[PDB]
PDB file of C-alpha atoms in Angstrom:
ATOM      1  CA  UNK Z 952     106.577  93.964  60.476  1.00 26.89           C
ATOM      2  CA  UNK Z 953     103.027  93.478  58.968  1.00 24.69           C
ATOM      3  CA  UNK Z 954     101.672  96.881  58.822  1.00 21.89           C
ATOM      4  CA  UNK Z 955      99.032  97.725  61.145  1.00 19.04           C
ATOM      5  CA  UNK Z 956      96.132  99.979  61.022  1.00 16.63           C
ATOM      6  CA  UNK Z 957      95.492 101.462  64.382  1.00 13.53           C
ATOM      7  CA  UNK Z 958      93.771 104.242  65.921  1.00 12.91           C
ATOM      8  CA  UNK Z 959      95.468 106.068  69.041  1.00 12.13           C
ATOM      9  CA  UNK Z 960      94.072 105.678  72.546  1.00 12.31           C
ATOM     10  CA  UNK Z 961      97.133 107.757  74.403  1.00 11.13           C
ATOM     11  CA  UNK Z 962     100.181 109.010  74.494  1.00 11.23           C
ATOM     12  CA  UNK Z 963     102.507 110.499  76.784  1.00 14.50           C
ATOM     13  CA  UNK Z 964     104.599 113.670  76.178  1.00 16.41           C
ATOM     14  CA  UNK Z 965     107.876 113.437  74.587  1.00 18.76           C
ATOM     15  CA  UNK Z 966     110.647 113.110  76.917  1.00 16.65           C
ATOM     16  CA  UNK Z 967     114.593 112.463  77.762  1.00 14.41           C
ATOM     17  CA  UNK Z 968     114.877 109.011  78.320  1.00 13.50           C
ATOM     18  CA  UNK Z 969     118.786 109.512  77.862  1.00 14.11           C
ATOM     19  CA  UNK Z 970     120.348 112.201  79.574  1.00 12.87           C
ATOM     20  CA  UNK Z 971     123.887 112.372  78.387  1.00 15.98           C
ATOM     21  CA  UNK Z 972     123.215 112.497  74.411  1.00 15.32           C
ATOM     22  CA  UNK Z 973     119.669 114.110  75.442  1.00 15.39           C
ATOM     23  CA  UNK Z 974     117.747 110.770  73.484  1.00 14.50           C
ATOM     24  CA  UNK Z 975     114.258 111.186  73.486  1.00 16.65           C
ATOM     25  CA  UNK Z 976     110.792 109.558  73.225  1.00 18.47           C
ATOM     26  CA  UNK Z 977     107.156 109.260  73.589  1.00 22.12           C
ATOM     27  CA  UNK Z 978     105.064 106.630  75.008  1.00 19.97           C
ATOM     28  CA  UNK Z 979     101.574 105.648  72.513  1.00 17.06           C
ATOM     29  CA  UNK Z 980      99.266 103.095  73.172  1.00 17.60           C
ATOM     30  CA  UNK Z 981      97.120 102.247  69.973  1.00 19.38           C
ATOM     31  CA  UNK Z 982      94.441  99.481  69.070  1.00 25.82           C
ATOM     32  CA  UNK Z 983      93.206  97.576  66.151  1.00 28.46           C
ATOM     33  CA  UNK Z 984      89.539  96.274  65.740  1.00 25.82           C
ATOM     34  CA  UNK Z 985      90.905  93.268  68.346  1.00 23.29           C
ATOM     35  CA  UNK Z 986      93.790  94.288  70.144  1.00 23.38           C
ATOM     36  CA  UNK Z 987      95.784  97.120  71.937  1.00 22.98           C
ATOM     37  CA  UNK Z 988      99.805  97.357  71.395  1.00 22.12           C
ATOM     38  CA  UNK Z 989     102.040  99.534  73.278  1.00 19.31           C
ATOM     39  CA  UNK Z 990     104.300 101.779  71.407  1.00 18.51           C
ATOM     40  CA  UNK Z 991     107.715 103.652  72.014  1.00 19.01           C
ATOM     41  CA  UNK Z 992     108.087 106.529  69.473  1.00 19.46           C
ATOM     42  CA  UNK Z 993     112.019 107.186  69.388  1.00 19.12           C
ATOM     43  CA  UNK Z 994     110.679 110.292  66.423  1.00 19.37           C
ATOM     44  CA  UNK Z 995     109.046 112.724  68.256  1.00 21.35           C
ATOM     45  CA  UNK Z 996     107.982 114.210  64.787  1.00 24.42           C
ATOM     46  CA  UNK Z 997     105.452 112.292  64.998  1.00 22.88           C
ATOM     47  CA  UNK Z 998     103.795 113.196  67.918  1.00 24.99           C
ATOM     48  CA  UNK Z 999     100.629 114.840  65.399  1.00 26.94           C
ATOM     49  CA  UNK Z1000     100.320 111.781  64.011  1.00 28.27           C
ATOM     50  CA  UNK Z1001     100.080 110.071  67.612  1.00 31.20           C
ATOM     51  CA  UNK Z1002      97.005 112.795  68.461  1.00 30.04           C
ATOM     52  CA  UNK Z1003      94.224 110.491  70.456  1.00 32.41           C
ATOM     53  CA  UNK Z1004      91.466 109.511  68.565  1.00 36.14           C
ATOM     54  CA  UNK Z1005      93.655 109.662  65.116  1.00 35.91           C
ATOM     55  CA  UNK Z1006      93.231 106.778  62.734  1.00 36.71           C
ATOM     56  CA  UNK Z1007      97.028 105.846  61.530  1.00 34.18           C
ATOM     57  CA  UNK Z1008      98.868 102.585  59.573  1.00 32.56           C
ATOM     58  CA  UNK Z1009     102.317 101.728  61.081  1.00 31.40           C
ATOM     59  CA  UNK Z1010     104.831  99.366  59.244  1.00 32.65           C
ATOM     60  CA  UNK Z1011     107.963  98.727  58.677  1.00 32.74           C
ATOM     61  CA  UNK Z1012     108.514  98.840  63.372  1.00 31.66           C
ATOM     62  CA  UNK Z1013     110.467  96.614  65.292  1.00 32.27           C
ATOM     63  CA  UNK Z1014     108.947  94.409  67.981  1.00 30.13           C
ATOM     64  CA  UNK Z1015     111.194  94.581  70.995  1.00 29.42           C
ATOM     65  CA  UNK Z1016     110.033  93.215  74.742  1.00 30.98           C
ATOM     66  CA  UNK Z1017     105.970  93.367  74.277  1.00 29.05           C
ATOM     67  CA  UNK Z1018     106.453  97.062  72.324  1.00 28.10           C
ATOM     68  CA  UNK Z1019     106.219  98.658  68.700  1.00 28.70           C
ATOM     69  CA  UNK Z1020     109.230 100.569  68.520  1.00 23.56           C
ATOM     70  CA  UNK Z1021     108.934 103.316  65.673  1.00 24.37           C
ATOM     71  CA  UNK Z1022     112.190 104.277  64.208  1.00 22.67           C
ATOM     72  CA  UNK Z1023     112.676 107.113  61.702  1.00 25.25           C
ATOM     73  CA  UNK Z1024     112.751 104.563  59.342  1.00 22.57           C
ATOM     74  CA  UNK Z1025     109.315 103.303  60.515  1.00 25.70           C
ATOM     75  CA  UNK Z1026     106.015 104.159  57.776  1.00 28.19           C
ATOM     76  CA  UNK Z1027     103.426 105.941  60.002  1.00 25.48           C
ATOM     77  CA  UNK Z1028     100.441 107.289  57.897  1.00 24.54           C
ATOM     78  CA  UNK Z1029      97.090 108.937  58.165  1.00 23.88           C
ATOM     79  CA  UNK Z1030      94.996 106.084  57.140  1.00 23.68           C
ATOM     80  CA  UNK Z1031      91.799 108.671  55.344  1.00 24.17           C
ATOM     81  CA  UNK Z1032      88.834 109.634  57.329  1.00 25.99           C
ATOM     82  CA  UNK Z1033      86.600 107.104  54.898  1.00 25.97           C
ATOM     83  CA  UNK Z1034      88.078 104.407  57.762  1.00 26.55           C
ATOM     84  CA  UNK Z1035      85.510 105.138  60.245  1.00 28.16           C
ATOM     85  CA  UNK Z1036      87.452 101.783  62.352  1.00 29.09           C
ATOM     86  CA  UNK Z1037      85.176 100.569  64.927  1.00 26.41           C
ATOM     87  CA  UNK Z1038      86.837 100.653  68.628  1.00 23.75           C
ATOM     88  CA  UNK Z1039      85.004  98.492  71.063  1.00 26.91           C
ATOM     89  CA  UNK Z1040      84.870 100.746  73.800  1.00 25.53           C
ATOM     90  CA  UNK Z1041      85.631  97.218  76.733  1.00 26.13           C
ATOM     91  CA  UNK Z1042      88.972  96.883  74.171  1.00 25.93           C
ATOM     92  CA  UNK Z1043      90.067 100.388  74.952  1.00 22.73           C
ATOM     93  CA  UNK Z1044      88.934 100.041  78.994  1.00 24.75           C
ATOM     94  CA  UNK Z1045      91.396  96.673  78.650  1.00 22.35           C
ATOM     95  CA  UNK Z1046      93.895  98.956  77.961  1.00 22.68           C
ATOM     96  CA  UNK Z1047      93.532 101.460  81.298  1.00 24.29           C
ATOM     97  CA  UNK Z1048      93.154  98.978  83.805  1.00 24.81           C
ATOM     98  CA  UNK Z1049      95.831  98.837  86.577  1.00 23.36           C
ATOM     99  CA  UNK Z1050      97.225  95.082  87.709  1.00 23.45           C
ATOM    100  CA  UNK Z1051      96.576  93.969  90.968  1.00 26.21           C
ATOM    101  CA  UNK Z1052      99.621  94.453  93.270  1.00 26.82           C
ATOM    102  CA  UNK Z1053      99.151  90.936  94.484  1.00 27.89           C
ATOM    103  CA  UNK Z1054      99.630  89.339  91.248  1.00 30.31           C
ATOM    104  CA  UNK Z1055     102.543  91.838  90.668  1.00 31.13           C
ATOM    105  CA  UNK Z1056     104.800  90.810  93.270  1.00 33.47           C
ATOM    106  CA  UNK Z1057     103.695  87.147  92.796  1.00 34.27           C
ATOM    107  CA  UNK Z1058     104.442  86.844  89.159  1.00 33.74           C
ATOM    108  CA  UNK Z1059     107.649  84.396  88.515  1.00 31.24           C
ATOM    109  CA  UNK Z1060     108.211  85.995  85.197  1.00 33.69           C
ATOM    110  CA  UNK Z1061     109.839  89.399  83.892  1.00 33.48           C
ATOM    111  CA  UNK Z1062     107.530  91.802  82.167  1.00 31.94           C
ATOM    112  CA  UNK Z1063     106.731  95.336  81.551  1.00 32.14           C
ATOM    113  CA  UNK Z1064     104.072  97.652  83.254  1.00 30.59           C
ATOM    114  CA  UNK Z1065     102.206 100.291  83.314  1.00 30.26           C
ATOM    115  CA  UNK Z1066      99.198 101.144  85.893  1.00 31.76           C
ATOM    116  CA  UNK Z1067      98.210 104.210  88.503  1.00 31.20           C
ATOM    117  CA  UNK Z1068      99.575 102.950  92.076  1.00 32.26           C
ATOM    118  CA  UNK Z1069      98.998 104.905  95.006  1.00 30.04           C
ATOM    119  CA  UNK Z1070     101.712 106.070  97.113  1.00 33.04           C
ATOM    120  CA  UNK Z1071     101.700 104.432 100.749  1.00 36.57           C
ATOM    121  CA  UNK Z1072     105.396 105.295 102.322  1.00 35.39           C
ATOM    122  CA  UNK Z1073     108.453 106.355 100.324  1.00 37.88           C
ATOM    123  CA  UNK Z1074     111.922 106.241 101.268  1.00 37.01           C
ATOM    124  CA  UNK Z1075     114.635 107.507  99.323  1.00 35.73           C
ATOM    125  CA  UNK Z1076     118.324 105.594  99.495  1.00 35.05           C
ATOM    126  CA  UNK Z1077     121.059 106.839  98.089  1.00 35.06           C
ATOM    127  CA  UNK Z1078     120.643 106.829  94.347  1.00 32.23           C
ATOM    128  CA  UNK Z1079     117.557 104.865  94.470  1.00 35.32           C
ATOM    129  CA  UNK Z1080     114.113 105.966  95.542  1.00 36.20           C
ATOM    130  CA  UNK Z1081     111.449 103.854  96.635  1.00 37.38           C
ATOM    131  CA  UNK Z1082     107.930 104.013  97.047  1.00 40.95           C
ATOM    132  CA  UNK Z1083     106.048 101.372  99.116  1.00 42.57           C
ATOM    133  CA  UNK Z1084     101.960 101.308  96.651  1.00 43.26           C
ATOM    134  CA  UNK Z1085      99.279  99.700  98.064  1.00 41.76           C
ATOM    135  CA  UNK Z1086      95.805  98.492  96.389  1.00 44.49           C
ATOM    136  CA  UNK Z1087      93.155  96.555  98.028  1.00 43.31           C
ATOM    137  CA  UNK Z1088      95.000  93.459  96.763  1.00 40.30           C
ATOM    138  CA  UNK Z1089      98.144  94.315  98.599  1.00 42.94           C
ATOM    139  CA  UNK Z1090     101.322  96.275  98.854  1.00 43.69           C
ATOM    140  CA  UNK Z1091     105.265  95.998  96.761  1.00 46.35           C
ATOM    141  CA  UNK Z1092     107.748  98.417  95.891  1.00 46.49           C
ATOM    142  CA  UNK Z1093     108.431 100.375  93.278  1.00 45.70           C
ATOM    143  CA  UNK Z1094     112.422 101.399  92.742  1.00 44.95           C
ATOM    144  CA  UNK Z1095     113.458 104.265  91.105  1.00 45.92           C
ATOM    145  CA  UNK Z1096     116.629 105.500  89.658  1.00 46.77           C
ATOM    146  CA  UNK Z1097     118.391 108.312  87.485  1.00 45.65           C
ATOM    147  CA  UNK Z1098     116.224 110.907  85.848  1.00 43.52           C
ATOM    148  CA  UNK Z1099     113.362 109.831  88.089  1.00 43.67           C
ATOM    149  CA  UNK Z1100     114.597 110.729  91.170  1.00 43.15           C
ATOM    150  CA  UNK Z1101     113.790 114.007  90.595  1.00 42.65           C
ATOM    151  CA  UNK Z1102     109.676 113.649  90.521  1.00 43.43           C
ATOM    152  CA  UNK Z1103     108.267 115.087  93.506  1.00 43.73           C
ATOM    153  CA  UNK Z1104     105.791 112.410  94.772  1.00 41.54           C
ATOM    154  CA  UNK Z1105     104.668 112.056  98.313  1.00 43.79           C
ATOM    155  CA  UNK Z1106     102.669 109.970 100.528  1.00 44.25           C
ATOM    156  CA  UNK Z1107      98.954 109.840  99.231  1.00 45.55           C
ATOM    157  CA  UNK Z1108      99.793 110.960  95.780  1.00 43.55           C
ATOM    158  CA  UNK Z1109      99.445 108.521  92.861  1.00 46.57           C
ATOM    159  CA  UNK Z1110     102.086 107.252  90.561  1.00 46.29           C
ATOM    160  CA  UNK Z1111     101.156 106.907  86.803  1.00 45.79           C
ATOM    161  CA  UNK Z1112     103.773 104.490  85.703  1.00 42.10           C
ATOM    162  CA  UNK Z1113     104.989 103.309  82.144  1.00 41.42           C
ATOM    163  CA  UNK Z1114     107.289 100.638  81.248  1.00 43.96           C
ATOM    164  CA  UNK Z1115     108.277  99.988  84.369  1.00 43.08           C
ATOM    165  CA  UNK Z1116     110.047  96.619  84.716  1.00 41.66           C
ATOM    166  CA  UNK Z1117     108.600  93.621  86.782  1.00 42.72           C
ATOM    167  CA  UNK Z1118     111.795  91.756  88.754  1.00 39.43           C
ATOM    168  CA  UNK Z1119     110.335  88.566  90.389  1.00 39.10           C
ATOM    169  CA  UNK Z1120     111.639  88.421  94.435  1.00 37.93           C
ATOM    170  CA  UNK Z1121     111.927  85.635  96.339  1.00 40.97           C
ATOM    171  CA  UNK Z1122     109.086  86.076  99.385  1.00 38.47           C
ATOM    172  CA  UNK Z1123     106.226  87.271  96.808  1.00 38.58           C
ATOM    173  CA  UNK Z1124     108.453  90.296  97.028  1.00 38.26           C
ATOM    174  CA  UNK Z1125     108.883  90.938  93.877  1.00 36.86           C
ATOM    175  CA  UNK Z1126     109.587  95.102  92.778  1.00 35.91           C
ATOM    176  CA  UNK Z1127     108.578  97.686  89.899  1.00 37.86           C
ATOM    177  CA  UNK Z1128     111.689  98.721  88.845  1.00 41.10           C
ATOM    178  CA  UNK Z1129     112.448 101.993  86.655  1.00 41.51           C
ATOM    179  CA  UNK Z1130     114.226 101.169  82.882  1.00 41.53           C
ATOM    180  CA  UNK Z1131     115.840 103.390  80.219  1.00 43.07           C
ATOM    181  CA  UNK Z1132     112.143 103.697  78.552  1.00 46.08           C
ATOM    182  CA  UNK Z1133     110.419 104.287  82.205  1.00 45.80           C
ATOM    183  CA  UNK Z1134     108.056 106.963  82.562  1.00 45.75           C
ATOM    184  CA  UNK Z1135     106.201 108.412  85.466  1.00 45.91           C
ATOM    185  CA  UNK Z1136     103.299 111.190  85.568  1.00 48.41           C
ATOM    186  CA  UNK Z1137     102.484 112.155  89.373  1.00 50.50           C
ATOM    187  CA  UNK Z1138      99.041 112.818  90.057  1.00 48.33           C
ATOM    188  CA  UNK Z1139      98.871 114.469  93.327  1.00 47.94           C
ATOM    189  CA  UNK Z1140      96.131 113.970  95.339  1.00 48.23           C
TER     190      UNK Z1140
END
């Protein structure tokens, strides 16, 4: 856990990832000089000290699955405003763009993902809701479960997704599926 100093690109708001003992979190995503990292806050204390823009040091994390995971136990400090870090403005773009649906459900590995998806059909099953998104590149599915089911998201509207879990198919069929950490901001269109 080699500290890092990063400055804050975006977070998400503090939510409940875990209904029954009400566990929450916040997404972050943060970059160095060189390179972005994606961050789960499990203190939501420190949501000031996530503020975009802000120049903080983080230490003392765990690295779990791609993510910084910041514990109470983790350091997170103002780093002083005699920083001044230099952000290449193409780092921070590297760090909005959405992956191409095509290469999605085409991956043969696991990984975690977050992107904007428009909403082409959605059909809800049971305890499981899914949402057929289509880019230029193609279409997939995204499944969603729990908590999520509840997010009022219709044909045409957009899906902001984060940490949502890649599961390789078969056919090139492989899905987004929803995790304990998922998060989803509608934008309705």
């Amino acid at each position: 856990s080699d500290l890092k100093e990063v400055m804050v690109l975006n977070a998400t708001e503090s939510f409940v990832y875990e209904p029954k003992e009400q566990k929450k979190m916040f997404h972050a995503t943060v970059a160095t000089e060189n390179e972005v990292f994606r961050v789960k806050v499990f203190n939501i204390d420190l949501k000031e000290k996530f503020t975009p823009k802000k120049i903080i040091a983080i230490a003392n994390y765990v690295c779990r699955n791609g993510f910084l995971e910041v514990y109470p136990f983790t350091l997170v400090a103002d780093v002083n405003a005699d920083r001044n870090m230099e952000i290449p403005a193409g780092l921070i773009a590297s760090a909005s763009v959405t992956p191409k649906i095509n290469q999605l459900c085409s991956q043969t590995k696991g990984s975690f993902v977050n992107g904007v998806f428009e909403v082409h059909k959605k059909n809800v099953r049971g305890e499981f809701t899914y949402y057929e998104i289509q880019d230029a590149t193609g279409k997939m599915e995204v499944v969603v479960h729990g908590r999520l089911t509840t997010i009022n998201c219709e044909e045409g509207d957009k899906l902001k997704l984060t940490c949502f879990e890649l599961a390789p198919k078969s056919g090139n069929t492989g899905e987004l599926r929803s995790v304990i950490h998922s998060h989803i901001k509608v934008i309705k269109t």
